[PDB]
């Protein structure tokens, strides 16, 4: 118990916490585009009509 402690349910948790940051960091740059689309089909929709 100690000896998975120490070596992997600390050091890979922690390397499973920067895993969870990477995927917060995708759902970031997710919405970035989202927000980029949005303008961008807002501006081409004002200049259709």
């Known amino acids: 118990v100690l ?3 120490a070596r992997r349910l600390a050091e ?3 390397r499973k ?3 969870n ?3 917060q960091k995708r759902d970031e ?3 970035q585009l989202g927000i980029l689309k ?3 089909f807002d501006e081409f ?3 259709f009509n």
């Open 12 to 14: 890979f948790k922690r």
């Open 29 to 31: 740059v997710k919405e």
């Open 3 to 5: 000896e998975e402690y």
């Open 38 to 40: 949005k303008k961008r």
């Open 21 to 23: 940051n990477a995927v």
């Open 45 to 47: 929709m004002a200049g």
């Open 17 to 19: 916490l920067d895993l």
